[PDB]
Amino acid sequence: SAGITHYIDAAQITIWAFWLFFFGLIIYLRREDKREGYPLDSDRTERSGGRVKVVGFPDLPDPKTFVLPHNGGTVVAPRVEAPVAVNATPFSPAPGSPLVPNGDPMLSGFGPAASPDRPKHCDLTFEGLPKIVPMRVAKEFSIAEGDPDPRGMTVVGLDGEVAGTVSDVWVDRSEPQIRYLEVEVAANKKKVLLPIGFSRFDKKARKVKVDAIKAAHFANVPTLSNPDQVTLYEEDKVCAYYAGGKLYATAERAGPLL
Amino acid sequence: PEYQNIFTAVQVRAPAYPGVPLPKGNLPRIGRPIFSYWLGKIGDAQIGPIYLGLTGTLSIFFGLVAISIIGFNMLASVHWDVFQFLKHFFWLGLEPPPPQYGLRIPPLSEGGWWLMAGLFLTLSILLWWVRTYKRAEALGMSQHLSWAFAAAIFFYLVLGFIRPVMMGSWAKAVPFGIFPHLDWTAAFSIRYGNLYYNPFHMLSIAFLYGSALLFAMHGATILSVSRFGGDREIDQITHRGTAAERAALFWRWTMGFNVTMESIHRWAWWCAVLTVITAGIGILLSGTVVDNWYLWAVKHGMAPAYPEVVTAVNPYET
Amino acid sequence: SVMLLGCEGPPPGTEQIGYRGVGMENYYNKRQRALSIQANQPVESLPAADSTGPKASEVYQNVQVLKDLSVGEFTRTMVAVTTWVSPKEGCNYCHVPGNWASDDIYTKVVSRRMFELVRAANSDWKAHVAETGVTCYTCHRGNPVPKYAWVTDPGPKYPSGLKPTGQNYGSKTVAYASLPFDPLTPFLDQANEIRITGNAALAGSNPASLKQAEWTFGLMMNISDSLGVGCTFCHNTRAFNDWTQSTPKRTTAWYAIRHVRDINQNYIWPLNDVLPASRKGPYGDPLRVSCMTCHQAVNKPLYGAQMAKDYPGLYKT
Amino acid sequence: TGLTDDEAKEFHAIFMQSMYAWFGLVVIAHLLAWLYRPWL
Amino acid sequence: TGLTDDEAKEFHAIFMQSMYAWFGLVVIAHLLAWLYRPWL
Amino acid sequence: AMLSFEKKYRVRGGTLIGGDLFDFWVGPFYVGFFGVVGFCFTLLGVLLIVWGATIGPTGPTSDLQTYNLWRISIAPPDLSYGLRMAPLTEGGLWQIITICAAGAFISWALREVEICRKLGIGFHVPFAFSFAIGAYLVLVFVRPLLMGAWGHGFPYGILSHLDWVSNVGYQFLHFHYNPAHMLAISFFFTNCLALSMHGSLILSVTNPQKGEPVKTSEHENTFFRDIVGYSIGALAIHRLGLFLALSAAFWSAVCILISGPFWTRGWPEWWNWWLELPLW
Amino acid sequence: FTMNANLYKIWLILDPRRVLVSIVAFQIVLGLLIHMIVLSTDLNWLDDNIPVSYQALGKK
Amino acid sequence: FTMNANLYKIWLILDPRRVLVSIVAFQIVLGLLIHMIVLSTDLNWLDDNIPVSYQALGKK
Ligand code: BCL
Ligand code: BCL
Ligand code: BCL
Ligand code: BCL
Ligand SMILES: CC[C@H]1c2cc3[nH]c4c(c3C)C(=O)[C@H](C(=O)OC)c4c3nc(cc4[nH]c(cc(n2)[C@@H]1C)c(C(C)=O)c4C)[C@@H](C)[C@@H]3CCC(=O)OC/C=C(\C)CCC[C@H](C)CCC[C@H](C)CCCC(C)C
Ligand SMILES: CC[C@H]1c2cc3[nH]c4c(c3C)C(=O)[C@H](C(=O)OC)c4c3nc(cc4[nH]c(cc(n2)[C@@H]1C)c(C(C)=O)c4C)[C@@H](C)[C@@H]3CCC(=O)OC/C=C(\C)CCC[C@H](C)CCC[C@H](C)CCCC(C)C
Ligand SMILES: CC(C)=CCC/C(C)=C/CC/C(C)=C\CC/C(C)=C\CC/C(C)=C/CC/C(C)=C/CC/C(C)=C/CC/C(C)=C/CC1=C(C)C(=O)c2ccccc2C1=O
Ligand SMILES: COC1=C(OC)C(=O)C(C/C=C(\C)CC/C=C(\C)CC/C=C(\C)CC/C=C(\C)CC/C=C(\C)CC/C=C(\C)CC/C=C(\C)CCC=C(C)C)=C(C)C1=O
Ligand SMILES: COC(C)(C)C/C=C/C(C)=C/C=C/C(C)=C/C=C/C(C)=C/C=C\C=C(C)\C=C\C=C(C)\C=C\C=C(C)\C=C\CC(C)(C)OC
Ligand code: HEM
Ligand code: HEM
Ligand SMILES: [Fe+3]
Ligand SMILES: [Sr+2]
Ligand SMILES: [Sr+2]
Ligand SMILES: [Sr+2]
Ligand SMILES: [Sr+2]
Ligand SMILES: [Sr+2]
């Protein structure tokens, strides 16, 4: 008998092996996925006083340690993070309801204005010099031939009003580029950072538009504990404020449209 | 309105960077840098220096040899008419040894240039492999690239060398030509009864589509959190910021679950390596194990049936 | 530019071939369909001949084919063969002047053979030629030499040190694709194997080479182009080899392939010794037949015009 | 909506009469369409 | 929308007359087209 | 439930439409007015694919009816119906499921939009999503329209749609020669390459050899500069990858848009414009 | 069938500009939709030609 | 069917540069659109051979 066709061929079983390796892969990737934000926030946890820490399937992976270079530290993941109050109040007492920011929305530090507490230290070059520093601290840097020098352009907010003028340019000493625009504010001549991401140029006019906030809001830009360098804490703090204006800076960004 | 972080609108220069320093043994670096205002319009304007060791030189060497055999051969097929060479270039190619020869080393005029170009190409790709492992060690880094390059090398090897040796015939490897190698692809599917019904080729297709899906999603994300320096992924990985937060949350609020600044790079990594690895497996079973995938799909009841509205009588059966 | 480039406008003419959703469909340019129709106009017939008279073989001297015809009918048959094959030249093209019965000029030894070629065709190949049948015009079109006749070609030049790629060139004969550029000699002259698909899912009992697959692909490109259609005209590409999923045109094409093997092998190669160099390719092989020769890019030569049924002198016995 | 109670009388008026003008043009077009070619 | 009430009767005027001119050229074209080859 | 840092951002407002009406969360998903339209479109779509599976091409008791996942398939109407709505049990169903799919993808896109407005992030993602939505639309709306009939759309079935691709592909004889196809394929392959390179990199620096600390930007640039004499840099690599994948989708959309409506011949034949230039 | 009209108040709750363009857009789209529906059906006016189909003015 | 003498106010609500360029875009698009609509039907005005066929009868 030389014809007993087997119903099982290498192609079936290779498709079997694959799916098994697959499932293990998926599972694993979802585990690396819980090295942050976990366990979750329910009132399942609060109701039970915490006896239901929310982690789901799969579960959380044993911590991993990152050894920052330069006497920098050591970070772990997953970690235990201290809760932080919410600077807002429930739009409804029902769960899943959004919260309204407390007080003046741009000040709230809630919503598009919220942000975490990153180190109060500076990111560093390879050598260990403050990575992000101004061109005034980073002597070498230079505009690229054929690019308007931002230095001296007028910074202008979302409504038209002048905001200030570019007093300097902050650069990456690691990957040479403009990261932050410095702004001598008109209303008080204080110096603030302006993330490049929020800034549009109008080279033919030497203006630097900013849809984010109004010219006035530039007065409240979060500040630097040193005008010649900036910490991780301070960057988030700077940007999130402008970001808040995307939903706050006007009595209309709140939406609807209809 | 808002900058999109598509085009660096105002650049800055600084003296070029020779790079983090390599240990003893890792040879000097060569070439001295330049800047392209235009690469600069979209990315690091610095061009080079480059590193070249024994490895790097033996790989550039083999690789260019292989490129010459293929090319010179193509000029020969048009009679040394560089004009005609220019005219039909897309259609020119260097075909493989004929089956009549099996796996024997063939005469120059009958395929031997292909076996030599295939030989030298492979040695040069695998030398570039070693190159990236060396360049990756000099930096204390890990071999994640090398595990991927090794996967793509896997597919390559399956295509032009492994399947051929298993099938006992150099004529089964792919020929060097644009249109010729496209034709090789189509004929390959045809010869084995439509490759669409090959499970592995379906998975490789889900994974190719997935590399486009993930990189488009992630990439769009990092730009959307570029405002918070999300591109600076390393520190968002060590010291989570509102970029990594807004990032993980956009997706969380959208599709119900999410990843992290470190893990998305693993989903993406694993999805790419998977393409080539299902892909190679896919070519491995063709002829070695399965000869007609459509039939295979029928035997496993996967091929759909449609009302037979058009049909033709079989002359072979008259 | 880097020009741009090659383009038709929407909407194309379309025809549904297979079941809805299966994708077996056809697209075409309406304009060019109309131009092909004007170029594929048929010559109207000559009035029937009454006759009523003796048989050709009784009133003529060298009638070895059109024997059983009445005189009138023979004469008519001569006028059709005249306008159909060589009207700029007239009667004298195939005859020695003053001597209608003589075979002292080759175009007649050939003409005679082609009388047996059309007859065999109209009477023996209906599973292929149906009731449309063929006639001289089909290939000649007012031309002495079918415009679309072929020859085994040698491809482009090679130094002496290396042998030809056998495939890999820009050729209109394989649809512009790079497959092998002469899929005709081994399939439309000789009878090499076209089948490459296995009939078993698992392997170990199908020796078809990939190369053979490419030759079949080339040839198919040829066929497709000659009849002016795509594979869903005859196939269901999920299974090129599956006859039940194919269209009745695959059956027809199958018998046609064998037919061209008979025209080329027993009617054309033999005329090679009495034909001039002007009618021969670089290997001494003579201009022969292909599907294009007759179809000239249309699924039925001259859009399925019925010319032959009007000339009874074109059928066997 | 930063309108006065009176600028919602005005806007409403122009809105309604304008809209009625549109509906008017419509009855015109539909009338032509029916005379030359009734569709029911 | 950054116009004065004095400069929108002005704008509306120009808008209306121009629009009507356009509509005119359109009516000419549709009239020549209807003559040369009526479509209904 | 929320991430351990989520409550602080779960602000009110940002809609386009609905306002406080549907301005709430469910588990981790954001609802919004478009989540509701989306869920409705989606649910009816799927529930109808279930009914199509239930009935089969010849009725629930015939042998072509099936619930096997590889083979369930809902196909368009014949071409004879053109752009008209065709009877339900003759491809009508397929038309409605399509309307639902287009509406669901568009709702999904608009809901990602409200989510950008809430979180205050750029809208790069839903814009990028819209490229896939576009490709889907050419494959069901644009092409079949330009082609005078909705039946030119692909059927919704796992392998049967693969068959659609196959025979449509083969009407042009050697599809590989479609030049836009050549582009799109180039991007799909390169995209898959950069992704493997970025992926590999991030993971190679944040986790280096034991005995080494998280690596640096300087390392990053130095490695790929070491290997290939160039490094596009961190920001931009995220930019490129977005370019490649969106373009890959683009050229797929155009390569299929021209296959029919603007080109009917085989595709290799297109390349003739090149062999006939007056240079050779 | 109650007593309060005064339905002008509608613009104190609904933004007029956006409503304006919304109706505008919807009208052009509904327009195209309807045009494609009738032109694809029997009440067709294009694929006819009055008083004679024009490409059947010459057969040749 | 008359003109509400305060219809100028439509320009206090709708931005003039946008309404204008919008009309130009929509119109040019419609134009290109219709032109190929008609060229794609029986009413063709290009492929007619008026007053005499322009190539020849073939290649000759
Ligand atoms: C069997 C079908 C009949 C026919 C039956 C109808 C019917 C019935 C109707 C149309 C209508 C329309 N048809 Mg028709 N139509 C035919 C064939 C055609 C053809 C063609 C190439 O064959 C074309 C181009 C059109 C095009 C038109 C549009 C002009 C018009 C409005 C549609 C729209 O989008 O509203 C756009 C919406 C707008 C608000 C713009 C309004 C523009 C009009 C022209 C007036 C301008 C007012 C302007 C906007 C003033 C604004 C205020 C200022 C800002 C101060 N029809 C066929 C033969 N057509 C509709 C119509 O005209 O209404 C009277 C209508 O009711
Ligand atoms: C022709 C019709 C057949 C077809 C036949 C095949 C065949 C045959 C194959 C694929 C392959 C694949 N097909 Mg397919 N394919 C079909 C239709 C499709 C469709 C579609 C929408 O219809 C899609 C999405 C795909 C998708 C794909 C990809 C998913 C996959 C390969 C990924 C890849 O890049 O590997 C390519 C990457 C590499 C090869 C590695 C590259 C690295 C090398 C070493 C680089 C060296 C660079 C060099 C040294 C630089 C110097 C240059 C020198 C000059 C050479 N196919 C149909 C059914 N397809 C693979 C497969 O499935 O096999 C099972 C394959 O081999
Ligand atoms: C059949 C033989 C021909 C051929 C015929 C065709 C034809 C015909 C086509 C392609 C198409 C393409 N081919 Mg091919 N192709 C050939 C061989 C190949 C090869 C190869 C190695 O040989 C490759 C790599 C490819 C690859 C490609 C890409 C260039 C392209 C598909 C990407 C795309 O459509 O994006 C588009 C992506 C989408 C449309 C997805 C959109 C997502 C939507 C909005 C949401 C989906 C939501 C859904 C509900 C998700 C499920 C989630 C559930 C909720 C859980 N082909 C062979 C030679 N190929 C297709 C194309 O061009 O694309 C239009 C096409 O029409
Ligand atoms: C798995 C299926 C088949 C096949 C499937 C397809 C399909 C399908 C397609 C291609 C196409 C191409 N293939 Mg392939 N291809 C095969 C395996 C290979 C191999 C190999 C040694 O293994 C090579 C070198 C290539 C190379 C090429 C690229 C030249 C090109 C698309 C670019 C891309 O993705 O780049 C990513 C990588 C880079 C950017 C790195 C650097 C590139 C190097 C230097 C390219 C070398 C060759 C070059 C063409 C010669 C001179 C330049 C010319 C002017 C263009 N293929 C496999 C075996 N390939 C696509 C095309 O259209 O072109 C034919 C296409 O449609
Ligand atoms: C996840 C699978 C994907 C993948 C991954 C992948 N590819 C890779 C890698 C990885 C991980 C590498 O590590 C390696 C790389 O270097 O990445 C940038 C590589 C690679 N991907 C490339 C190609 C490639 N990969 C492809 C596909 C894929 N690879 C998949 C999409 C494709 C396809 C199918 O489209 C291609 C074309 C190469 C650039 C590189 C391997 C390079 C190599 O092996 O080099 C061999 C030899 C040469 C290049 C010869 C040198 C010729 C020089 C360019 C000329 C310089 C001359 C100089 C002037 C000197 C003077 C000369 C003297 C002799 C006179
Ligand atoms: C355009 C470039 C690439 C891309 C980008 C892209 N896709 C995206 C996004 C982006 C940026 C999103 O943000 C969005 C997303 O949510 O991320 C996953 C999305 C998305 N990518 C997905 C699909 C997808 N994208 C693909 C590809 C691509 N998308 C390109 C590779 C592909 C393919 C074919 O390769 C698929 C299958 C979805 C998971 C998701 C959007 C999900 C969604 O819109 O959900 C709402 C709708 C439903 C839940 C279903 C509606 C119910 C239907 C009525 C029934 C289904 C009908 C369907 C037409 C039948 C087809 C059957 C098939 C078996 C043939
Ligand atoms: C009767 C009635 C009411 C019905 C009942 C309703 C029912 C049936 C209830 C069931 C409810 C349940 C079970 C589910 C609901 C189902 C829903 C609505 C559908 C899911 C739709 C959805 C989009 C699923 C797609 C799944 C997949 C695999 C998508 C592909 C995307 C991808 C590969 C996923 C993983 C990777 C992800 C998520 C990356 C996102 C991501 C990226 C890309 C970053 O770059 C980044 C950077 C820095 C930090 C974080 C991130 C990050 O999270
Ligand atoms: C930390 O991050 C990282 C870095 O930073 C340090 C790196 O440097 C690196 C190293 C990376 C590199 C050195 C990058 C190398 C890049 C590679 C290999 C990609 C190869 C791409 C090419 C050769 C270019 C091909 C394309 C062209 C030549 C231009 C083509 C132009 C065309 C087709 C016409 C333009 C029009 C279109 C495409 C149509 C419309 C386009 C769209 C709709 C797309 C939209 C896009 C956007 C961006 C919004 C990595 C991996 C990294 O992860
Ligand atoms: C005029 O031109 C001058 C500059 C001279 C040179 C020009 C050169 C040019 C332009 C060359 C152009 C070349 C092109 C475009 C080539 C394209 C190639 C393509 C697209 C190839 C696609 C696929 C090819 C594959 C997958 C080949 C695989 C082959 C393999 C894997 C061979 C392996 C062989 C080995 C390892 C040999 C082993 C030998 C042993 C040791 C076993 O022998 C005993
Ligand atoms: C109007 C022009 C023509 C006339 C009047 C004509 C007349 C004749 C006559 C009277 C005969 C019988 C001679 C005999 O065998 O005694 C004959 C035979 C023959 N003629 Fe013609 N002829 C004409 C054109 C042609 C043409 C154009 C061809 C070829 C294209 C042709 C091919 C033949 C052949 C092959 C025979 C021998 C027939 C057989 O064996 O059956 N003739 N012709
Ligand atoms: C360009 C795409 C086409 C491809 C790839 C193609 C491919 C093939 C293949 C692979 C076979 C062999 C199946 C086997 O291995 O058993 C085949 C057979 C055949 N095809 Fe084609 N085909 C194409 C177009 C056409 C067209 C247009 C026709 C008819 C006009 C046609 C008529 C036939 C016939 C009759 C056979 C059977 C021949 C025999 O068995 O001797 N094909 N085709
Ligand atoms: Fe990234
Ligand atoms: Sr066609
Ligand atoms: Sr049943
Ligand atoms: Sr020429
Ligand atoms: Sr006309
Ligand atoms: Sr002319």
Coordinates of N, CA and C and ligand atoms in Angstrom, one line a residue, chain A residues 175, chain B residues 6, chain F residues 131 187 190 197-198 201 220-221 224 230-234 237 240 243 246-247 250-251, ligand 8:
Chain A
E175 N 21.9 66.8 19.2 CA 21.4 66.6 17.8 C 21.1 68.1 17.4
Chain B
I6 N 7.4 68.6 10.0 CA 7.6 67.9 8.7 C 8.9 68.5 8.2
Chain F
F131 N -5.5 58.2 5.3 CA -5.0 57.7 4.0 C -5.5 56.3 3.8
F187 N 7.7 51.5 -1.4 CA 7.5 52.1 -0.1 C 7.2 51.1 0.9
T190 N 10.5 49.5 1.8 CA 11.4 50.4 2.6 C 10.8 50.8 4.0
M197 N 14.8 49.1 11.4 CA 16.0 49.8 11.9 C 15.7 50.7 13.1
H198 N 14.6 51.5 13.2 CA 14.3 52.3 14.3 C 14.0 51.4 15.5
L201 N 17.0 50.1 16.9 CA 17.8 51.2 17.6 C 17.4 51.6 19.0
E220 N 23.4 57.0 19.1 CA 22.4 56.8 18.1 C 23.0 57.3 16.8
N221 N 23.3 58.6 16.7 CA 23.8 59.1 15.5 C 25.1 58.5 15.0
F224 N 24.6 54.5 13.2 CA 24.1 54.5 11.8 C 25.1 55.3 10.9
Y230 N 25.7 58.0 7.6 CA 24.6 59.0 7.7 C 23.7 58.6 8.8
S231 N 23.0 59.6 9.4 CA 22.0 59.3 10.3 C 21.0 60.4 10.1
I232 N 19.8 60.1 9.9 CA 18.8 61.1 9.6 C 18.4 61.8 10.9
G233 N 18.7 61.2 12.1 CA 18.4 61.7 13.3 C 16.9 61.4 13.8
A234 N 16.8 61.3 15.1 CA 15.6 60.9 16.0 C 14.3 61.5 15.5
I237 N 13.5 60.5 11.8 CA 13.3 59.1 11.5 C 11.8 58.8 11.7
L240 N 10.1 60.2 8.6 CA 10.3 59.4 7.4 C 9.4 58.3 7.4
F243 N 6.3 59.1 6.4 CA 6.2 59.4 5.0 C 6.1 58.1 4.3
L246 N 2.7 56.4 4.7 CA 1.5 57.1 4.1 C 1.6 57.0 2.6
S247 N 2.8 57.2 2.1 CA 3.0 57.1 0.7 C 2.8 55.7 0.1
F250 N -0.5 55.6 -0.5 CA -0.9 56.5 -1.6 C -0.7 55.8 -2.9
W251 N 0.5 55.4 -3.1 CA 0.7 54.7 -4.3 C -0.1 53.5 -4.5
Ligands
LIG8 C1 16.7 57.5 17.0 O1 16.2 57.4 15.7 C2 16.8 57.0 14.6 C3 17.7 57.9 13.9 O2 17.9 59.1 14.6 C4 19.2 59.2 15.3 C5 18.5 57.6 12.7 O3 19.3 58.5 12.3 C6 18.3 56.2 12.1 C7 19.0 55.8 10.9 C8 18.0 56.0 9.7 C9 18.4 56.4 8.5 C10 19.9 56.6 8.2 C11 17.3 56.6 7.4 C12 17.6 56.1 6.0 C13 16.4 56.2 5.2 C14 16.0 55.1 4.4 C15 16.8 53.8 4.3 C16 14.7 55.3 3.5 C17 15.0 55.3 2.0 C18 14.2 56.4 1.3 C19 14.7 56.9 0.1 C20 15.9 56.4 -0.6 C21 13.8 57.9 -0.6 C22 12.8 57.4 -1.6 C23 11.9 58.6 -1.9 C24 12.3 59.7 -2.8 C25 13.7 59.7 -3.5 C26 11.4 60.8 -3.0 C27 10.2 60.3 -3.8 C28 9.2 61.4 -4.2 C29 8.0 61.1 -4.7 C30 7.7 59.6 -4.9 C31 7.1 62.2 -5.2 C32 6.5 63.0 -4.0 C33 5.0 62.8 -3.8 C34 4.4 61.7 -3.2 C35 5.3 60.6 -2.7 C36 2.9 61.7 -3.2 C37 2.3 62.4 -1.9 C38 3.0 61.9 -0.6 C39 2.3 61.6 0.5 C40 0.8 61.7 0.4 C41 3.0 61.2 1.8 C42 2.9 62.2 3.0 C43 4.1 62.4 3.9 C44 4.3 63.2 5.0 C45 5.7 63.1 5.6 C46 3.3 64.0 5.7 C47 17.3 55.3 12.8 C48 17.0 53.9 12.3 C49 16.6 55.7 14.0 O4 15.8 54.9 14.5

